[PDB]
Every structure is written in structure tokens, then in C-alpha cells.
Ligand binder design. Structure first.
Ligand SMILES: CCCCCCCC(=O)OC[C@H](COP(=O)(O)O[C@@H]1[C@H](O)[C@H](O)[C@@H](OP(=O)(O)O)[C@H](OP(=O)(O)O)[C@H]1O)OC(=O)CCCCCCC
Ligand SMILES: CCCCCCCC(=O)OC[C@H](COP(=O)(O)O[C@@H]1[C@H](O)[C@H](O)[C@@H](OP(=O)(O)O)[C@H](OP(=O)(O)O)[C@H]1O)OC(=O)CCCCCCC
Lengths: 606, 606, 63
């Protein structure tokens, strides 16, 4: 909790203010500080609230002269860092690098202060609480704040380039993690000026990500363009048009299981979809989608449509037989009931249904064999919650397979009430065909804005519906507890009083009006108010709200359609035979250029 | 009424035009004015329509040379002010200060004219009629128009700094009351350069408001930031990020009962909600809301939801008994009537209802004990009319408590007709759960734009709608007054003819169509025109008006949600136990900095 | 000159006509419709001409 950091900061100000030496270092006044240097009664190695020395204070307040005076007073004092909880290993050389003082950093490296010191405090590790993530190293701080002479001075004074923190990120990862600053891109070249003998570009962190993959997942599009200046080279040009080949070795990532594009499209960050429109990614996945992704996705979409046709014509003809006992009940409808399994398969039409039943059961088996390892391989909250990878549809297809498997369980036990799981499966599965509607460019993002409205608008509006239909349903019920349920029985008991007020809210069921009897006088008053506040006011406010949400999607239609086709292209890249999915790009081993696969695109500029 | 001021202005022009001396002072011609100085037959102390002298006219028309000519001719004439109704104390020094004439002001203070003269007329006091509020003092006029040399000349020539008018405002208040002019802020610095020994910053007006509090209630954001350039100080900086502490002593205002934030959020001025987003105000109420305001508001919201659940399941099971007299009536619905209290509590389920009845009555008591002092402490029109402080919900909760207490009155008197107070209480109280819907950031401003549509759109459209359903209802009644009420009885008598035309306007009830009888030929003509003008034209126009006001709110959603959570945060700051609501901010008495409470925030700039 | 499509510069040239109008006056003579030029500027929507016409009628009495 962040109030502890406030308490530590003004406790630091307390320990500065109590000590005359730390106050003299803060205020930048040499007059009493000379006497503080001269006398041996005072202790120069005194601690702050955290462990900040006088050198830490004089580095923090841009006071180089008092800092250098106390380094002539104590040359050994520079190497000791802080030792409390928010600053576990903070040296003042980190502060002087971060404040971009060239003379103070030069004096600190001239007196032999530590350059490989890890500042492993909680303030320097990344969090929503800390406003910056500058790293844990001085070379990290120098390359991350945007200073050139300081970082080259740190190169010439030791400071080995490979520096993995507690998160395991090196300098390039947390040079990428800045909020899209252009000039640090050039300073990336400075790091690539001094990377020598694997290389720094290929070392992963504790998450297991290449810096190129970190630029992919974090949405740093300017750094992605700067990185693909190095990989590409033009092979010929004529007139306005150039042809250049991009290296897809770390785009496709054929050796690695967890691919680069899987890190791009399943990123939690919103800005990681503008990197998916770039010049070596868009042409590659467009070639994958047009050459392979759309035909295999279309034949799987036709196969699932035919599977649901073969399921609905199987469950329409379900075993049903006439009930043995008579009805003898007013307010009741029943002609026929469920059929026992001993007579459910007696004719040829029952066998034609039965082979369809085995088709549906093996369809459930091949659905859950394609989801349970897939939900295990990435996690539950990663895959169900992601709207780009079809997670709301992938919980629906799993619910289908569990429901029709439960229907097969219930049928062999020969117990009744199989209308309910068959009805949920039959209504959820035909809505899962929208999962196969992401492939078409015409009707693609309509399915993403439908789920966007379900999870955005109608999760906030459902609680404002349930304070109106509950109150008005309860108000309509009291006016018709006194009266009869025969002439006007739309509010007879309270569940149908809720349901009728819900339908009257939705303007589907007509208003409860029996003009052949005298209605209660309160009912017209409390229903006129309902027609004002609910059918007129509350509903069409939500309808215009849906229109605003539809406008919000429709300004960015292609940006989500391309993300949807990337998600399904890399999902059909996995789970599919290798002979039926050859490697995208052209090989280049027979062209003598190496065992790296490339992609040639040609453009047209002035 | 403002035509009197026009009559006074042209009567002033009359009294200028009749007198040759005042005409010569207006026209700035010295030729006959020399003879007017020379002769003793004319009276130099003559009056205008109000009391304006000729030196008043020469100050009014930037005629400094003629003013100095009669000012050598009459040195004592400068001190007399005007003496009729709109200018009861206006001197010419006020006019010369207001017109920024440096030489005339220097001459007027050189001849000993009064500098503490109070111009307490109706034109100088604030009103919608007067276009400016420059104050009542010369120092007021000089600071308020924004002239530096004039106000410093007034400081060196007397003019004590504390100058409270008939409204009681000093100079700083009516420097703040300007229409957001930036440069007067620097003029404010001049006053705070010359304020010495309480101070001028802490003296209140007759309303009882600090100039800090007047800056808060008037929405002057630039003055508010300029005031907090003095209060704040940075305690440390490193790299891009500074940590600074703000003084919340006059923000939280712990000693004063009527707090500062209560003056900000209950301000009638629209521009006082952009000052609620400022850099220590947003963080203070966000700390109050996240640390305390949201959990106690959520547990009160759950307690009120459970209280309404325990009230609706109490009144659904209300006592009713089978009636003794038989129906014997066509066009009537009745099975059963209300139950007497002597048999209303006979079983264990009646006792389970009865403890819920005492829960609801004590809930009404603890509601009206939390509203009647609260409506008395701020007034009726201040609290019910303010839409930010939940006033439309606070009249609804009061109406609920009065209605269920009227139910408690009616039930012990054992008289019938108790369906109506339960029906009004049960429709109003579940709509008051929207009052607890202001807390959530997801579903917050929906409940403010619903009341915005009720009080904006359906106040104007109902008068346009009650001249269509009245005329068409009367037109439908005449076409079916000739006919029967059995085969088509939707317009049998005139109340249900109004109600059916209302429902047909809302398109809930179907059109009156009985195809098994010959309808009147006028009815199809006057119902086809109804389907044009009412169902098609006026309804969907009002839907488009809802779309426009929905867009108008949705551009400024967060600005009202933050004001709503400020309103409920300062409502739960009051009326709640002190041990459960500690003082927000950190103490600082143990940090030796004084008995003032602060708030440290850190920012991130370049 | 009023019937132009809202051209500003002939406004000043209107002053030229009122520089040489002498002895009723040209400002008050009507057409066959029976309209004053002030009324023609009113009915044709020439707002710049109307403002320029109201520069001459108005005068400030105090400031
Ligand atoms: C279908 C069954 C449910 C599927 C479960 C998986 C459901 C699912 O995939 O979304 C998770 C959703 C949060 O959405 P999620 O984490 O994906 O992130 C939001 C998403 O990107 C929306 O599209 C964004 O627009 P909007 O503002 O929303 O318009 C929204 O804001 P922004 O990016 O524009 O700034 C993003 O925050 O949480 C629920 O409401 C579910 C409650 C019901 C849980 C019911 C549990 C059964
Ligand atoms: C719930 C029971 C009634 C609660 C009583 C308290 C009702 C209440 O709190 O509002 C008072 C309201 C005036 O609204 P009010 O004084 O608060 O000021 C208006 C308010 O700020 C609106 O939100 C603004 O938008 P809109 O243009 O409106 O969209 C409007 O214009 P603007 O700021 O945008 O320029 C502001 O003028 O007057 C009535 O219509 C009530 C008639 C029915 C009186 C019924 C008396 C029982």
C-alpha cells in the first residue's frame, strides 16, 4: 500500500532535517559544512531513515560541490548503499546517473564507486505503484533516461553489458519498455554499437522472451521499425519501386514452440495491435490467411455447420412417447413424455438417428481433446478472458461439449429431464458459429462488437434493469394480489410478475389491459409511470448507448478484423498437420544465403 | 427593473446638456470654460441628475485638462460624491481609477480627495442587472481592472488593505470573482506583496467564506493553482519525477464545520467542477474514496439492498383475507380484500413477517433522522434542487419513508385502501437504489443522465404530448361514443380513452382493431393520421432527443462521475462515526513541521 | 448596392454615395415595392450593410 512510501519519504525528510550534515547537504551551504568536515566528533557514516548517506542526499538535490567536499572528507563513503525495504541496494551513483550530472558521475567513477551494484529495492522494480521502471543498474539508468555521454562513460568504466535483474530483463528489454520515445531508439544503436562476443539480442528473460518479442508484445512500433531496418535489405530497385526481403526467422520462430505472433495477438496491452499492421507482419499473415488460412477455416466452418445441422436434425427427432397416465389437471399442458432406451431404438429411422448420435458424441470428444490441453498450455485467465482469441466463444464451445456429453450421460441412465441440457447445448452451439464468422471480411467485426456490447453495456445496464423491473414487478403484484388471476393473470404469482414486467420492459408482450372488467385505479397510475420510465426512457437510452458503442467499434473496424484473422491464423497454425501446413515464406537454402527463411515484398514510393 | 437605469442615464445626459459648464466639461473645450472659471455668478457646486459634478463629468469623458481647470478653480469640489439612488457614494476618483487615467488619479490624490470612500450604490453592488462587479473601493477598482501603477499609488496614498463592502468581500474575493482573467493573478501577487500584519487571506465575508473557499466555489481554476503555488513545496526530485507535499489544512478544513469540498461540490455555478480535478484535490478524494469511501458506500449499498429485499418479501406476504360479501357484479374483479389487525398476526409466519415490519419501520425512522436535520442545515431549495448531491434521489427516499410511515399509521387504524402507499413506496424505493449506483465507475453517470432526461427532455415534451393524446383521445372517443363498448371498448369512457391513446402513443397496446364488426369510417382516417403523427413522428423524434442528450452527457462522463463520488464522499465524511472515519492525509506533528496535515503526491514530467 | 452577395468593400463605397448625397434625402426614397434601403438591407439579410447603417444612427453617450 502506497501510504507506506509517503511515510518513508517524509521520514527521510525527518532524518535529513534532524541531522545538521544532511541538512547542509540538502540546502547546498558550505559554511557550517566546513566545520562539519573539520571536527572528528561527528560521524560521517551516519544513516538516514532508509540508509541514505550525506552523499546520497547531495546527489539527490543536485549538490555536486558539497558531495565532492565530503568525498575529500571520506573517499570510502561512496560504495555503501541504502539498506531498508524500499531502497534495498540503491547507491548514489544510480541517483547521479539518473539526474544526468556529468561531473558527479565522473567523480564517483574516479573514486572507484561500484558500477555493477544492483539496486534491488521495491521502488525500482516494476509495479503500478512506481511511476517509472528505469531498471536496477547504472548502465540501465543511463541508457534508459536518455543520456549519451553518461552511458558511454559507463561503458568505458567497466559495466559489462549483459545485466539481468530480478525479473531477468537486460538493458534492451527495459529500453523497450519506455512510453514510445523516439530518441532512445537511436541510443539502442549505441547499445548495438557496443554489443560484442551468444549476442545480447538473443538472451531471454525469466519470462522467456527475446527483446524483439518484448517489442512485439509491448506494442513499441517505432522500435519494431528500427529493429526491422537491421534485418531487411533491398535486393533491387527500379523507378519508383523497390523490392526488399524481410527475415522471418524471429517472426515465424520455427524452432520455438511459443511463437512470436502468439505473443503479439494474445497481449493484454491495447497498443500491441498497431504493431500487427507493420510491413513485415501484415504481408506474412495475409499470405498465410489467403493461401492457407481462409480455405482451411472455411472448410472447418462448413464442417461445423454440417455438424450442427446433423445435431439439430438428430435432436428434433428425439425419443418421445405418449404418457401412460391421464392429465386430470387444470392449468396444465402435457401430451407426451420422454421415452425409455429399451424402446428408443427399434426402427430404421431410430438407427439413422443413432449414427447421428455417435457423430455428435465423437464431435464432443474431438472438441474437448482440442480445448483441454489448449486451456492447460496457457492458463485459464489468459485464454477464456481474451476477447481477441475467441475466448467468449471458446467457453461456449466447451459448455456445448460438456452439455451434450452430460446429455449422453443422462440418456444411458434412462432418467428424465433431458430437455434442459439439450436445450442449453442447442442454443449455445448455434451461437458459436459466430466463432466461424470472424474469417469473413464483410461480417467479421460484427461478432466482436456483439460480445463487446454484452460485456460492456449489458453488465452495467443489467443492474439498472434489475432495480426497475424488480420494483415495478413488485408494485404490479400488490395491485393484483387483491384481484383475480383469471381475467388478468399476468401478475398472478411473483416469478411471472417478474417475467411479465421484464417483457413489458422489452416491449414484446402487450400491456395488461382487460377492458371488459374494472381495473384497479392504482394500476393505471403505476403502469403509465412504467410506460414513461421504462419503455420510453430507459430502453431507448440504452439503444442509443449501443449505437455509440457500435460507432466506437466502427471507427476501428479493420484493426480488430485483422487481429481476429491473426488470432485464428496462428490458432490453425497449431493443432493441424504439418504436411497440410507448410512453412510460410520462401526457403533460401537452395539460394545459398543460409538456413533462414525470408519474405520478399515490393513497395511503391516517390 | 432596468428601464429606470436607462431613464437615469439619459437624465444625466439631460443635466449635462442643460448646464453650459457640464456640457463644456463633456465636450473638452476650454474657450467658454475659461469664462465659466472667471465669473462668480455661476455656481460650481451644481448638481446633476444623480449628483455628478462637472469634475465627475470631466473624469467620465477622459477630460483631464478641464478637470484640472475647475480643480484649480475649486480644490474642495473633488471630495463630494453623488447622492441619488444608483450612485449613492460614487466619487470621481472611482471613475478616474476605473478609466486608468494616471495623471488625473495622481492629481486627485495630490489634492487630498478621499481614498476610503465607499461607493455603495445599486450599480456597484453585484447583480444580474450590472454587467460588472468591480467593488466599492478605489483600491478595489484599481486591482480589479488590472492596473499596477494606479494600485501602488493608492497604497502609497493611504488606502488600508482590509476593505469589506456591504457584502463583506475584501479585495481578494473580487479579484477572484473576475471572468477567469489570468493577469489579475499577478495583480493578486501585488496584493500579497503588500499584505502585512490576522492576515488578509483568512478574513471571511458576510457569507462566511475564505478567499480560498470563494475560489473553490466560483470555479476560478487559475487563481486556485496560483494559490497553491504558495502552499506547496517540493521536498525532493530525481530524474523526471518530483515528490511534492500539499497543505490540506484549508482544503480538508478540519476545524470548520462547513467544509471547503462541500462548498465546491454543492456550487450552483457550472464551472466549479473543473476545479475538482486539480492536482491535490483529485488525489485527496481518490484516497478517501478508494481507502474508505467505496467500502463503506458498498456496505451501505448492500445493507439498503438487503433492507429492500426484507421489505419486499414482507409486503408480498401482506395480510389479505377472503371477502364475506359476494361479488354479484359484471365488469368486476375481486376475490379477496384486506385483513383486520386482530387476525393479521396469528401464526408463526405472521411473526416472521412482523419482525420484518419492525425492521422496515425502524428503517424509516433511521432514514428520517438522517434527512430532516440535513434538509434543515442547508435549506430546502439548496439540497432538493441540486442534482450533484443526489437531491432527486433524496426527495424520493424521504417520500419512501413518509409513505411507509403513513402505512404504519394506516395499518394500526385498521382502515382499508392500503394498496396505494405500499405501491408508491415500492415503486419509489427500488428506484432509489440508483442512488447507490453513483459509486461504481462502470455504471455511474447512467443514473445522472436518466435524471437529466427526466428533468430536461420529458418536462418539455410532455406538454407537447398532452396536446396530442388529449386531442386524439377526444377524437377517438367521439367516434366510439356512437358505438358499443363491448366489441371495441378501448374508448368506452374518457379516462380509459386517455389511457389507451397514451398507450397507443407509446406503441405498447395494439391498435384497436375488431375485424369481425364494421368499424366507423372516420376511425380509420383519424387512426391512420394518429399512426403517422404520433407513433412514427413524435415518438422517434423524442428518441433522437434522448440520443442527443446521451451524446451530451457521454462527452463529459468522467466529469460528472468524479463530482458524484466527491458528493457522496463528503456526504459520508459527515453523519458517520469519527473512529471509523479518520482524518485523511498524514499528520506531520511527529515530523516536527507543525500541526498541519499534508498530502504527498509525486508526478512525472520531462 | 445592397443587393450584392455580401461584399465588404462597396460598404465603404456606400459612404462615397453618402459623401455626395445632398438636398428629401436618398436614404428615405422608396422603390415601387415601397421599401426604404434600410428596409431592403433588413429583408435581404445584408448584415454588414446593416451594421454600417447603424454606425451612423448610434452614438455613445458615455463610457
Ligand atoms: C460468455 C461467458 C463469459 C465469458 C468469460 C470471459 C469474458 C471476457 O472475455 O471478458 C472479460 C470481461 C472484461 O473484459 P476484458 O478483460 O477482456 O477487457 C476489456 C475488453 O477489451 C473490452 O473489449 C473493452 O471495451 P469495453 O469498455 O468493455 O466496451 C474494455 O475496455 P477498453 O479496452 O475499451 O478500455 C476492456 O477492459 O469481464 C466481464 O465483464 C465478464 C463478466 C461476466 C463473467 C461471466 C462468467 C461466466
Ligand atoms: C424527483 C422529484 C422532483 C425533484 C425536484 C428537484 C428537481 C431538480 O433537482 O432539478 C430542478 C429542475 C431544474 O434543474 P437544475 O436547477 O438542477 O439545473 C439544471 C440541471 O443542471 C440540468 O442538469 C441542466 O441540463 P438540462 O438542460 O436540464 O438537460 C440544466 O441546464 P444546463 O446546466 O445544461 O445549462 C440546468 O439548468 O427543475 C425541474 O425541471 C423540476 C420540474 C419538476 C418539479 C417536480 C416537483 C416535485
Amino acid at each position: 500500500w502506497e501510504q507506506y512510501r509517503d511515510r518513508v519519504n517524509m521520514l527521510q525528510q525527518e532524518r535529513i532535517r534532524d541531522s545538521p550534515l544532511l541538512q547542509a547537504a540538502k540546502e547546498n551551504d558550505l559554511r557550517l559544512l566546513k566545520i562539519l568536515l573539520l571536527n572528528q566528533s561527528c560521524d560521517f557514516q551516519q544513516r538516514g531513515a532508509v540508509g541514505e548517506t550525506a552523499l546520497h542526499v547531495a546527489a539527490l538535490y543536485d549538490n555536486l560541490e558539497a558531495a565532492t567536499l565530503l568525498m575529500e572528507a571520506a573517499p570510502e563513503l561512496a560504495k555503501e548503499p541504502a539498506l531498508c525495504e524500499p531502497f534495498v541496494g540503491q547507491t548514489a551513483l544510480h541517483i547521479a546517473v539518473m539526474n544526468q550530472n556529468l561531473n558527479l558521475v565522473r567523480a564517483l567513477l574516479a573514486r572507484g564507486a561500484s558500477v555493477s551494484a544492483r539496486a534491488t529495492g521495491a521502488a525500482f522494480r516494476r509495479s503500478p505503484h512506481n511511476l517509472i521502471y528505469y531498471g536496477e543498474h547504472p548502465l540501465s539508468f543511463a541508457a534508459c533516461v536518455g543520456s549519451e555521454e553518461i552511458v558511454r562513460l559507463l561503458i568505458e568504466h567497466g559495466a559489462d553489458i549483459r545485466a539481468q535483474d530480478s525479473l531477468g530483463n537486460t538493458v534492451l528489454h527495459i529500453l523497450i519498455l519506455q512510453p514510445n520515445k523516439t530518441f532512445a531508439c537511436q541510443m539502442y544503436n549505441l547499445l548495438l554499437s557496443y554489443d560484442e562476443h551468444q549476442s545480447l539480442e538473443l538472451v531471454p528473460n525469466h519470462q522467456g522472451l527475446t527483446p524483439f518479442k518484448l517489442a512485439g508484445v509491448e506494442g513499441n512500433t517505432v522500435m519494431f521499425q528500427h529493429l526491422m531496418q537491421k534485418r531487411k535489405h533491398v535486393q533491387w530497385t527500379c523507378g519508383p519501386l523497390t523490392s526488399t526481403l524481410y527475415d522471418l526467422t524471429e517472426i515465424d520462430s520455427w524452432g520455438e514452440e511459443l511463437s512470436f505472433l502468439e505473443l503479439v495477438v494474445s497481449s493484454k496491452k491495447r497498443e500491441a495491435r498497431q504493431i500487427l499492421e507493420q510491413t513485415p507482419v501484415k504481408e506474412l499473415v495475409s499470405f498465410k490467411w489467403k493461401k492457407y488460412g481462409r480455405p482451411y477455416f472455411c472448410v472447418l466452418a462448413s464442417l461445423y455447420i454440417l455438424y450442427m445441422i446433423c445435431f439439430t436434425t438428430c435432436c428434433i427427432y428425439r425419443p418421445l412417447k405418449l404418457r401412460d397416465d391421464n392429465r386430470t389437471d387444470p392449468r396444465d399442458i402435457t401430451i407426451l413424455q420422454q421415452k425409455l432406451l429399451q424402446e428408443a431404438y427399434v426402427t430404421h429411422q431410430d438407427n439413422i438417428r443413432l449414427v447421428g448420435e455417435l457423430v455428435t458424441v465423437t464431435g464432443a470428444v474431438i472438441i474437448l481433446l482440442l480445448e483441454i490441453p489448449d486451456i492447460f498450455r496457457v492458463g485459464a485467465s489468459r485464454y477464456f478472458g481474451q476477447t481477441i482469441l475467441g475466448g467468449p466463444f471458446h467457453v461456449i464451445i466447451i459448455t456445448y461439449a460438456s452439455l451434450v456429453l452430460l446429455t449422453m450421460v443422462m440418456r444411458l441412465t434412462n432418467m428424465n429431464g433431458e430437455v434442459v441440457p439439450l436445450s442449453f447445448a442447442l442454443v449455445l452451439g448455434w451461437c458459436s458459429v459466430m466463432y466461424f464468422a470472424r474469417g469473413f471480411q464483410m461480417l467479421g467485426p460484427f461478432t466482436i462488437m456483439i460480445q463487446k456490447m454484452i460485456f460492456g453495456d449489458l453488465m452495467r445496464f443489467c443492474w439498472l434493469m434489475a432495480v426497475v423491473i424488480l420494483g415495478f414487478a413488485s408494485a404490479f403484484h400488490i395491485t393484483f394480489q387483491t384481484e383475480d388471476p383469471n381475467n388478468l393473470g399476468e401478475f398472478s404469482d411473483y416469478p411471472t410478475a417478474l417475467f411479465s414486467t421484464f417483457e413489458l420492459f422489452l416491449t414484446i408482450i402487450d400491456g395488461p389491459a382487460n377492458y371488459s372488467v374494472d381495473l384497479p385505479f392504482m394500476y393505471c397510475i403505476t403502469y403509465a409511470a412504467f410506460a414513461i420510465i421504462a419503455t420510453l426512457l430507459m430502453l431507448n437510452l440504452f439503444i442509443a448507448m449501443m449505437g455509440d458503442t457500435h460507432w466506437r467499434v466502427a471507427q476501428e473496424r479493420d484493426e480488430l478484423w485483422r487481429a481476429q484473422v491473426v488470432a485464428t491464423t496462428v490458432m490453425l497454425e497449431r493443432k493441424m498437420p504439418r504436411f497440410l501446413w507448410p512453412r510460410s515464406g520462401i526457403c533460401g537454402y537452395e539460394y545459398g544465403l543460409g538456413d533462414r527463411w525470408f519474405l520478399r515484398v515490393e513497395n511503391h514510393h516517390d
